[PDB]
Curated annotation (Swiss-Prot), chain A:
Induction: (Microbial infection) Expression increases when incubated with M.tuberculosis or its lipoprotein LpqH; induction is TLR2-dependent (at protein level).
Gene: PPARG
Recorded consequence of changing Q68P: In colon cancer; sporadic; somatic mutation; loss of ligand-binding
Name assigned to this protein: Peroxisome proliferator-activated receptor gamma
Species this protein is from: Homo sapiens
Post-translational events: Phosphorylated in basal conditions and dephosphorylated when treated with the ligand. May be dephosphorylated by PPP5C. Ubiquitinated by E3 ubiquitin-protein ligase complex containing FBXO9; leading to proteasomal degradation. Ubiquitinated at Lys-18 by TRIM55 leading to proteasomal degradation. Ubiquitinated by E3 ubiquitin-protein ligase STUB1/CHIP; leading to proteasomal degradation.
Length: 257, 246
């Protein structure tokens, strides 16, 4: 029965809204230009320096540190959302930890896309907007850390997915049977089918004109995995290059593999 | 008319049954007996045996925390069922659910509980009251306070149907801190109180002022929740998983 699938989608969207402070719609409104929400934009060091006045060590490191603290915030929100997903809590604790560890970074990048536009990415709760170039400008090796994300962001954004569509999609990502170190795959696999079934109906209903959106969206997953692998490689260089720099413990634990 | 209250009462009962895997009647049948006896842990060995059938002090508490998380999701599904809960401001729904859950968990917990022991693993196993009491502080005290409440609360002899309305009343609480709008929450709560009152009289005509007595309990729930959090802070003083339970 579709109603069951529709109801499940409704639940996920509801959980998605409560779980995440900044929705895609809110981000789009600030970016679209729909006065109250207008974002201070950092395109230069002085603007970044200025940003402190109205927005919440080394600048390249400080900015990289900002993401690490923010990622921690995302992990907490994703983790909160993940519990919402029907039957995720029920799964074996190790599997819950394993799914979240592998799943979280992919979701963050997907979720990040909502903030991003070819020019820049929203920061500090949408209070400020950071230019893509400025992040690109960052001194090696830290400069091309958001360059991969931006590309995924235009390509993925192209989809034009609404928050409701995303909430189911993030759910599918988290509940992935094919995760290294899983004790039970079958319980996870069954849940994903429901998410997959719900997502498929949701896209058709939501984006009737769009064709093979489900297939196109599912393809996106390969890109997310590629991005995560690239980031880990980049992270490895950062640690050796910067002995002094410190990584968040929660973030480090996810990193270990 | 009155039919609406009865309609509401049945609707909550159906939602309550669907929402929760294990019911007081189902729990009752196992403690009373009626079809395989739950594995019983009275000893450290039995608990070790218990894991396979289905450190010492710390691990058990985690299971309760793990179970609680399951309860919150189950409660959330049932909470949605309640008429007009979904319509409420999303911040309010989160606030009612957040503050509401602990009181409901203990109330739900009570149905499983008997003076001697509390059921676990969906009635698969029974943990002896004495064994829980034995556990090294702060853990030894932790369960016992719940047992005392359960015995007194169980005294009412409420049926699952009575609980379902009662559970809705707890969730729909105006007092909760940070509510943006309370007119809708109190107005819905008022209707549920009306439904609960009618349900008790019909379901328990012989009982006198059962409604008032049930309303009285809430004070018990608030103190128990107050106690559990206070003990919990003390527990703190001794990875990703933290995030889950939080
Ligand atoms: C270690 O954690 C990570 O994997 C993160 C992934 C990530 C990427 C984006 C993200 O969300 C955000 O986009 C954000 C944010 C943010 C928040 C608060 C803030 O004020 C202090 C400032 C901010 O820019 C959240 C997480 N990436 C980084 C981690 C550390 C340092 C830099 C990054 C970058 O992604 C990065 C980035 C701009 C150049 C170069 C690199
Ligand atoms: C999963 O097994 C458990 C372990 C611990 C508890 C503790 C409280 C409870 O109500 O139910 C439980 C169930």
């Amino acid at each position: 029965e579709s109603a069951d699938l529709r109801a499940l989608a409704k639940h996920l969207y509801d959980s998605y809204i409560k779980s995440f402070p900044l929705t895609k719609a809110k981000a789009r409104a600030i970016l679209t230009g729909k006065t109250d929400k207008s974002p201070f934009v950092i395109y230069d060091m002085n603007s970044l320096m200025m940003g402190e006045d109205k927005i919440k060590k080394e600048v390249a490191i400080r900015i990289f540190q900002g993401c690490q603290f923010r990622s921690v915030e995302a992990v907490q929100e994703i983790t909160e959302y993940a519990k919402s997903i029907p039957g995720f809590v029920n799964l074996d604790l190790n599997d819950q930890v394993t799914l979240l560890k592998y799943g979280v970074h992919e979701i963050i990048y997907t979720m990040l896309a909502s903030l991003m536009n070819k020019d820049g990415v929203l920061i500090s709760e949408g209070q400020g907007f950071m230019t893509r170039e400025f992040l690109k400008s960052l001194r090696k090796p830290f400069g091309d850390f958001m360059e991969p994300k931006f590309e995924f962001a235009v390509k993925f954004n192209a989809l034009e997915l609404d928050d409701s569509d995303l909430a189911i999609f993030i759910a599918v990502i988290i509940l992935s049977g094919d995760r290294p170190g899983l004790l039970n795959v079958k319980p996870i696999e069954d849940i994903q089918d429901n998410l997959l079934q719900a997502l498929e109906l949701q896209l058709k209903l939501n984006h009737p004109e769009s064709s093979q959106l489900f297939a196109k969206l599912l393809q996106k997953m390969t890109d997310l995995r590629q991005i995560v692998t690239e980031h880990v490689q980049l992270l490895q260089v950062i640690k050796k290059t910067e002995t002094d720099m410190s990584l968040h413990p929660l973030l480090q634990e996810i990193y270990k593999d």
